[PDB]
Amino acid sequence: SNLIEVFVDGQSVMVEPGTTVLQACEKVGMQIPRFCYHERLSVAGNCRMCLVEIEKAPKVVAACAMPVMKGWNILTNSEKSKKAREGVMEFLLANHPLDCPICDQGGECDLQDQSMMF
Amino acid sequence: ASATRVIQKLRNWASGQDLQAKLQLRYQEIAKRTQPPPKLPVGPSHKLSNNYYCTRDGRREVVPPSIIMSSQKALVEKKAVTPAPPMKRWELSKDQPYL
Amino acid sequence: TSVKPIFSRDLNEAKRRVRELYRAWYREVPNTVHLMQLDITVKQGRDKVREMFMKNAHVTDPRVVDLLVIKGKMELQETIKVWKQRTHVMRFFHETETPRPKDFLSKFYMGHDP
Amino acid sequence: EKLLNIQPPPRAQWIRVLFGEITRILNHIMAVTTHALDIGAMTPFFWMFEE
Amino acid sequence: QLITVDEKLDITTLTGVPEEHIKTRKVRIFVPARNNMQSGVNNTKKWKMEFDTRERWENPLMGWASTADPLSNMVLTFSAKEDAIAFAEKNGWSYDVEEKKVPKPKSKSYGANFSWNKRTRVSTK
Amino acid sequence: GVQVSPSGEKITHTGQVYDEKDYRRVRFVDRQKEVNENFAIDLIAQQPVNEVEHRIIACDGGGGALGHPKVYINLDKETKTGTCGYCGLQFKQHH
Amino acid sequence: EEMLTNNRIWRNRTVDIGVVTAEDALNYGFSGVMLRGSGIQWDLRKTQPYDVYDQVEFDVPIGSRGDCYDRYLCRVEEMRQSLRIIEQCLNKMPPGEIKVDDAKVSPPKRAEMKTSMESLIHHFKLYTEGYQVPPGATYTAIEAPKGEFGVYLVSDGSSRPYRCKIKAPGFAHLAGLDKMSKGHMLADVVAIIGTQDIVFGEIDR
Amino acid sequence: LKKTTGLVGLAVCDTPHERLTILYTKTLDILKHFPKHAAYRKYTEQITNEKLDMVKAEPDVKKLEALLQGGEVEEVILQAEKELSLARKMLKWKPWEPLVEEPPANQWKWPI
Amino acid sequence: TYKYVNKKEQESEVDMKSATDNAARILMWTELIRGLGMTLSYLFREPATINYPFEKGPLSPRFRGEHALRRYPSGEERCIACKLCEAICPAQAITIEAEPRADGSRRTTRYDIDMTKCIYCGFCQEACPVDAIVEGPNFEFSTETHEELLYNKEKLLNNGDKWEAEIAANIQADYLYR
Amino acid sequence: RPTVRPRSDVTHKQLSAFGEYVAEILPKYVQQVQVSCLDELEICIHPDGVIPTLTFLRDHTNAQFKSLADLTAVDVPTRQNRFEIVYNLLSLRFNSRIRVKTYADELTPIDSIVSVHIAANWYEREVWDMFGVFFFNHPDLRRILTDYGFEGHPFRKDFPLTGYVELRYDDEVKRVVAEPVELAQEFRKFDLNSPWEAFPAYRQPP
Ligand code: SF4
Ligand code: SF4
Ligand code: SF4
Ligand code: FES
Ligand SMILES: [Zn+2]
């Protein structure tokens, strides 16, 4: 009934169409990192931090934009879904000026964590 | 120091062992202050390749415990069991056995 | 609700177990005040005691009452002996701190105290 | 370290044992001697508290 | 053996808490807000039960800030709202609940930024 | 080398002196008010601008392991200059 | 030891004093010096080794004839047999690293937080937020001079703990104070305190 | 022959193979009261018969130790008294009763 | 390895050769002499006392003592209100309320220590990413009032305006070392 | 792999199989034996069967756990039986440990173990001082740590850090008197609990 079988490390989820992989994974709790995305602004994959290995794929997808089709199993804590992040945050942190103590957003930075977490 | 080569024999006769060589306190030939500045060693993973966080993350290799009854979920000849071999009576302390 | 009971059944059996304790505190105001000197004579000490049992009369649960006897026995077991001092026994009274206005009108000339 | 699941490195483990049995030497000296003070012997106390 | 009773389950005598911090002490049960600076949301999923606030005067010597109510910095993490009220009623405190604020499931189609007909035709890609 | 109230008390880095109608000045009676005369805002303008080459550089606080994490600046402003929030230095582009 | 351990005033002030029964110690859980001083062969450093104690070649000075002179001789020789441990813990120190390689569980090199960005952020969150342990629980242990000092640390995903607890080994030694001083007078009760090692701060919380 | 144990308070009370037998034999004889299906009963038999095959065969105590692992036999003797009380103290208890008294939900899921 | 501290009781056929040697260890006292003649040695030894205010003892350049706010070599207060030198301070000892400086820059209006708090633990000198706060060799700063220890900031600069001649040599031997 | 505290897989099975050994032998009052990745055992039970499992563990050859180390009381003020009370023992003969924990409300007393382990003479009592959890058959229950006039049970999570009293010397009466609590600095509760679970596959779905 306008619902699609989707898998997240084995979950038997059902979701409306036109939904991202986030809006699926967000149900369970596999909260994906985010820099280009907001829950209310238009979609634009520029950060390329929300990557994940969909099961049975050589290429990853920007989950912010990639909608969700039947039979797709995600691997959020794969090696390939963390290599995709340890690299990314290790790119951002090459033009960033180390100003955290100067920075107004010390504990309210959504990057300091997401360099720690992943 | 200024031990006049008699009281040493008074100390040692009154105490025992020749203790001018193993005296109480320190004078010299120790800790010649301002040792040079050291260039430390570095730890591993300063190696720039085959160095991810996945092959070092100590805290994501843990998992929840492995429950074995789970009074509603699992709830599931045979030999006796102990948590280990009953370990040994050790030894009897060679080179200083009875002190 | 089919609870485990402890030391008694429905209240009116626990109410004599109470009185075993008042049966001690009522006879251990005069022994304390003399053995370790104090200011109270004997009486306002006894008023304070009953003023504590006429704080917990609102209780209606046997398990709670069977518990509150115990903490009274401890303080009794601490009071019957000299393990306390002249500062602990005379601590209940709230002698020093000014009692706040129980009314409304004087209660907010000092303090945002609803 | 159990919870985090880490063995610290050897050199730090190694010194953690060294002071880990100099502190052993302390409390003995503090309860060999104080066990002698309150029994009465006040001298070895001072012989050690330069040591 | 067992005994029957159906009562309110009061405990307020077994804590001290003499008179002021029993009655005249509201309590707020809620799911804390998403710190809108951060897009991270793990501070939700819980039912913190912080209490109201009272005077925080200025210590006239140092400029320090000081208080009278020790019962002000009193976070408590719970797991379900049905359990929170049972905990606060068990100590007689006038709970004041706020409900969850679930966000909606919204449809966000990337291509619809790039419509012919429609009005969502974004600029700057 | 500080500025002083009409009541006669010493001002800090910040304007901090109590008004006349203030019982706080008691604590200075038969004592004195500790103060540092070394206002940073006075010392720092008494420092020449380092007129370097290329538009972008690194700064430090006199020793790379010894202060001022290596922040950079874009020195495109010929009108004003560029600062580093740690220090209070200033820079130009030379061109 | 020239002076005390053949001293009448020591020995008959100390010997036959506070006779501890072996199997009763365990009922009280002394589990430090105060049982090995009655012949219960035991030491975590060799019976449940954790750190680099695995290669030290040392010894445990058991005490028989439970009394506060054979506790005393244990307390002496445990001072000596650090020096076998030191000499072995001294002449083979490996060159290596300190403050574990991971920057999430250790702060980084102070010269390295100051250029390399990531080492700065961790330095900004270690010393504000911290480790972010996993939930779980342990009961560690270590034989300090007192005995089985150990911690029942209990955790939660928040950076902060959730009811740590400290196992004060003296805490049980002192509960046995009023059983081992039975048929003995005052003056040795002083000695009982010293040969239970009341470094109060363990006892106090 | 054995002068003293390493322990203290645990006296000698010599002549093993004598008090060790009578204790084990009685444990089995206290058993035959339990159910066959109560799982306690079908393990101690493996403990004691294992231990008793080795005392009933070997007269040498030195080699009897390191053979029923746990040395200082008189600690093993005391350990048999220790077993003995457990059985008779546990018949009045009932470990083999039916299923648990059903604790409440979400009573051990730790991370909170 | 387990070592009997005291296992020497064996019936050695105690004869008059030796059993009276214990009586020679007794009534003609010798073990007491042995414990006495020792002590007599030390009074002929070098007493390790020192005339403190004229002879002060040894320290090392990492000694945790009195705090001080350092300053750059060109004026310019080195502290910049990061607010992790209290978030780590386990004593909860500190309040460092801050603002812009009126230069547009970033500095404090407030800085504090209760030195009766401040366990002198060393977290703040090392957590400071700038070495703006440090913990210097003063340990003669006992005062007669609990109030004169509540160092605000002007003391704690002009203290840092004092030992900077000293700290910049201990730290000179302690950079490249932590 | 260097920095991961090597697992030493084998003793999990010893403590797992032995974990089963205690269940099927004692199926009454025993729920969810388990074990963490840290090879250390945990056994949750019902309060009516406290002793008969202890005495199995003090008195049985295959479970010589005749030495007690702690008896704490852990708060969970969101369930019914908020107070998880924990035991933890040790074999001198088998060289391993265990953990035997239970539960209680603010009033569902637990019969004590002092006939079994007298080591718990005072560990039991602090819980009475620190949480107000009565025990049956315990000799001379009374306060340990708190003042002789301290109401409350402070290690409860309901009791604030700085409690409800502070003492001082009011010279008019020549005593160390108490009056209500009046700070000078106000301990500053921080929100150091970031987002980002940090531990997936280890968590709570709604
Ligand atoms: S707080 Fe975040 S945004 Fe600010 S400097 Fe640090 S990493 Fe960059
Ligand atoms: S002392 Fe250091 S860490 Fe603290 S605010 Fe100043 S510069 Fe920042
Ligand atoms: S030394 Fe430690 S306790 Fe003292 S102010 Fe610094 S961080 Fe706080
Ligand atoms: S978070 Fe930027 S592409 Fe998805
Ligand atoms: Zn700069």
SS3 per residue for J31-69: EEEEECCCCCEEEEECHHHHHHHHHHHHCCHHHCCCCCC
E50 neighbors E28 (Cβ within 8 angstroms): yes
- Note the maximum CA span of chain C: 50
CA I98 to chain centre: 31
The residue of chain J nearest to residue H97, with distances taken between CA atoms, is J28
How many structural domains are present in chain E?
A: 1
Q: The tokens of H38 are what?
A: 């109560």
Task: Report which residue type is found at H40.
Answer: Y
Please indicate whether residue G121, judged by its CB atom, sits closer than 6 Å to ligand 1. yes
Locus of tokens 């574990």 = G100
Handedness of CA A71, A76, A78, A82 (dihedral sign): positive
Show the tokens assigned to J160.
């604030």
Pull the structure tokens for residue F28. 């200075």
G neighbours by CB contacts (3+ pairs under 8 Å): A, B, D, F, H, I, J
G27: closest CA among G145, G172, G174?
G172
Provide the 8-state DSSP code for A79: S
Amino acid at C114: P
**Alpha carbon C88 to its chain's center:** 13
**How many CB atoms neighbour CB J79 within 10 A?**
24
Query: Cβ contact (<8 Å) for B86 and H43?
Result: no
Kind and range of the H or E element at B14? helix B7-15
> Which of I150, I124, I154 is CA-nearest to residue I136?
I124
Three-class HEC string of chain H: CCCCCCCCCCCCCCCCCCHHHHHHHHHHHHCCCCCCCCCCHHHHHHHHHHHHHHHCCCCCHHHHCCCCCCCCHHHHHHHHHHHHHHHHHHHCCCCCCCCCCCCCCCCCCCCC
In the block, tokens 């010390």 appear at: A106
Domain carrying residue F53: 1-95
Over the range D20-44, which residues count as b (16 or more CB within 10 Å of their CB) and which as e?
bbeebbebbbbbbbbbbeebebeeb
Element (H or E) spanning E97, and its range? Answer: strand E95-97
Instruction: Give the tokens for residue E108.
Output: 């966000």
Closest CA to J62 of G26, H50, B66: H50
Helix runs in E32-117, H state only: 81-89
The count of structural domains within chain C is: 1
Give the minimum alpha-carbon distance from A107 to chain E in angstroms, rounded to a whole number: 9
First to last CA, chain H: 61
* Dihedrals phi, psi of E67, to nearest 5 degrees: -145, 175
* Backbone region of residue I118 per phi and psi (left: phi > 0; alpha: psi in -120 to 50; beta: other values): left
Q: In the block, which residue shows the tokens 């604590």?
A: F27
Query: Of the candidates F4, F58, F10, F17, which has an alpha carbon nearest to the alpha carbon of residue F36?
Result: F10
What torsion do the CA atoms of G46, G47, G48, G52 make, to the nearest 10 degrees?
10
G21 Cβ partners below 8 Å, 6+ apart?
G38, G66, H8, H9, H10
CB A68 within 8 A of CB A8: no
Taking CA J152 as the corner, what is the angle to CA J151 and CA J154, rounded to the nearest 5 degrees?
135
SS (H, E, C) C50-63: HHHHCCCCCCCCHH
Query: Which amino acid type is present at position C24?
Result: A
How many Å apart are CA G200 and CA D25, to the nearest integer? 18
Measure the CA–CA gap between G10 and G1, rounded to whole angstroms.
Answer: 11
Tally of CB atoms within 10 A around A91: 11
Closest CA to A73 of A28, A18, A118: A28
- Decide whether any atom of ligand 4 lies within 6 Å of the A92 Cβ: no
Q: What are the C-alpha distances in Å from B70 to residues B78, E67, J45? A: 22, 48, 12
What's the CA-to-centroid distance between I65 and ligand 2, angstroms? 18
Residue H81 sits at the vertex; the CA angle it makes with H80 and H85, to the nearest 5 degrees, is 115
Q: Is E103 on the interface with J (CB under 8 A)?
A: no
The tokens describing I91, both together, are 């004593």
F46 burial class (0-12, 13-18, 19+ CB within 10 angstroms)?
exposed
Instruction: Using DSSP bridges, classify how beta strands F90-92 and F50-51 pair: parallel, antiparallel or unpaired.
Output: parallel
- Three-class secondary structure of residue D1 per DSSP: coil
Centroid of chain to Cα G52: 16
Structure tokens at J15: 């403590």
Please name the amino acid found at residue E8: K
Q: Is the dihedral of CA A101, A102, A108, A111 positive or negative?
A: negative
CA dist list (Å): I98 to A104, B31, I81, I107: 12, 45, 6, 6
Nearest CA among B94, J24, H80, F58 for reference residue I3? B94
C-alpha angle I15-I20-I25 in degrees, rounded to nearest 5:
140
Q: Which of I50, I74, I65, I53 is nearest to I133 (CA)?
A: I65
Show which residues on chain A lie within 8 Å of chain G, measured between beta carbons.
90, 93-94, 96, 98, 100-101, 106-107, 112-113, 115-116
Q: What share of chain I is helix, strand, coil (3-state, %, to 5)?
A: 20, 10, 70
Buried b (16+ CB within 10 A) or exposed e, H25-55: eebeebbeebeeebbbbbbbeebbeebbeeb
Going by alpha carbons, the residue nearest to atom 8 of ligand 1 is A100
Please report which helix (H) or strand (E) contains residue E78, including its range.
none
Query: Residue E67 in contact with residue J183, Cβ under 8 Å?
Result: yes
Whether G203 contacts G169, CB under 8 Å:
no
Give H69's Cβ-side CA count (13 Å radius): 14
- The Cα–Cα gap between J80 and H103 comes to 10
On whether any CB of chain G is under 8 Å from the CB of F63, the answer is no
A touches B, CB cut-off 8 Å, minimum 3 pairs: yes
3 state DSSP class of A4:
strand
The token pair that represents G179 in the structure block: 């059983």
Neighbours of chain C (3+ CB pairs under 8 A): E, J
Question: Phi-psi bin for A111: left (phi > 0), alpha (psi -120 to 50), beta?
Answer: alpha
Structural domain containing residue E98: 1-125
User: CA-CA distance, I132 to I68, in Å (whole number)?
Assistant: 8
Check if the beta carbon of residue H111 is closer than 8 Å to that of residue J203.
yes
Residue pair G75/G47 in contact by the 8 Å Cβ criterion:
no
The answer, yes or no, to whether any atom of ligand 4 lies below 6 A from the CB of A24, is no
Q: Which residues contact A23 (CB under 8 A, 6 or more apart)?
A: A15, A68, E105, E106, E108
Nearest C-alpha in J relative to C63: J107
Q: Extract the tokens encoding I54.
A: 């004229």
Phi and psi based region of residue H17 (left: phi greater than 0; alpha: psi -120 to 50; beta: remaining): left
Q: Chain centroid to CA E53: how far? A: 13
Element (H, E) at I134: strand I133-136
Residues 6+ apart with CB under 8 A from E34: E40, E41, E43, E44
DSSP string, B19-69: -SSS-SS--SSS--SSPPPP-----SS-SSSS--STTT-SSSS------S-
Cβ I115 under 6 angstroms from ligand 3: no
Q: Count Cβ atoms below 10 Å from residue E92 Cβ, excluding itself.
A: 16
Q: What is the SS3 assignment for J121?
A: helix
Mutation choice for ligand 2 from I96, I105, I128, I131, CB with most ligand atoms inside 8 A: I128
**Ordered DSSP codes for chain G:** --SSTT-HHHHHHHTT-S---HHHHHHHT--BHHHHTTT----HHHHS--SGGGS----B----S-STTHHHHHHHHHHHHHHHHHHHHHTTPPP---S-S-TTTS---TTTTTTSHHHHHHHHHHTTT---PPS-B----EE-SSBEEEE--B--SSSS-S---EE-HHHHHHHTHHHHSSS--HHHHHHHHHTTT--HHHHH-
Give the CA diameter of chain A.
Answer: 53
Strands annotated E in chain J: 30-35, 41-45, 70-75, 83-88, 100-101, 110-111, 135-136, 166-170, 175-179
DSSP state letter for J139: T
- 8 A C-beta contact, residue I69 and residue I157: yes
The CB density around residue I102, as the number of other CB atoms within 10 Å, is: 11
Of B81, D31, J69, give the one whose Cα is nearest residue G48.
Answer: J69
Eight-state DSSP code of residue F24:
G
Instruction: Name the 3-class secondary structure at J125.
Output: helix
Q: What is the C-alpha to C-alpha distance for residues E1 and J99, in angstroms, rounded to an integer? A: 30
Which tokens go with I59?
């320290």
Token digits of residue F32: 């004195």
Tell me the β-bridge partners of A54. Answer: A74
For residues H93 and J23, the answer to whether their CB atoms sit within 8 Å is no
**DSSP label at residue I107:** E
Listing from the earlier edge strand, what are the strands of the sheet with J41-45? J30-35, J41-45, J100-101, J83-88, J70-75
* Chain centroid to CA G162: 23
Q: State how far the Cα of I64 lies from the Cα of D13, in Å rounded to an integer.
A: 24
Length of chain C: 114
Please name every residue paired with A7 in a beta bridge, in sequence order, or none if there are none: A73
Residues in chain F, overall count: 95
Nearest residue of chain I to residue D42 (CA atoms): I39
Token pair recorded at residue J203: 């968590």
Between A and B, how many residue pairs show a Cβ–Cβ distance under 8 A? Answer: 11
What DSSP character marks residue E113?
Answer: G
Rounded Cα gap, residues F59 and C1, in angstroms: 74
Rounded to whole angstroms, the Cα distance separating G69 from C110 reads 66
Neighbours of chain B (3+ CB pairs under 8 A): A, D, G, H, I, J
Cβ(J177)–Cβ(G137) below 8 Å: no
Total count of residues recorded for chain J: 206
Residue C109's domain comprises: 1-114
Whether E106 and A39 lie within 8 Å, measured CB to CB? yes
CA neighbor of F82 nearest in space, from G113, F13, F71, I71: F71
Q: What is the DSSP track for I15-72? A: -TTTHHHHHHTTTTT-HHHHHHHHHHHHTTS------TTTS-----TT---EEEE-B-
Measured in angstroms, the CA of E45 and the nearest CA of chain H are apart by 10
Q: Is I94 in the pocket of ligand 2 (CB under 6 A)?
A: no
Q: In terms of C-beta density within 10 A (0-12 exposed, 13-18 middle, 19 or more buried), how is residue F16 classed?
A: middle
- Ligand 3 pocket, I124 CB below 6 A? yes
C92 vs C88, E83, F18, CA distance in Å? Answer: 8, 35, 44
F11 to F4, F7, G131, H97: CA distances (angstroms): 6, 11, 43, 83
Q: Which of F60, F64, F52 is nearest to F87 (CA)?
A: F60
Experimental technique behind these coordinates: cryo-EM
Distance CA G117, CA G130 (A): 18
Q: Which residues pair with J42 in a beta bridge?
A: J34
Please indicate whether residue I68, judged by its CB atom, sits closer than 6 Å to ligand 3. Answer: no
Nearest CA in chain I to A103: I82
CA distance I77 to I85: 16
Residue I154 has a CB neighbour count (10 Å cut-off) of 20
Largest CA distance in chain E: 79
Q: What tokens appear for B73 in the block?
A: 């979920």
Token pair 């610290």 in the structure block, residue: D8
CB A26 within 8 A of CB E106: no
* Interface contact J149-C90, CB threshold 8 A: no
d(CA A115, CA A89): 6
Q: Which ligand is nearest to the CA of F61?
A: 5
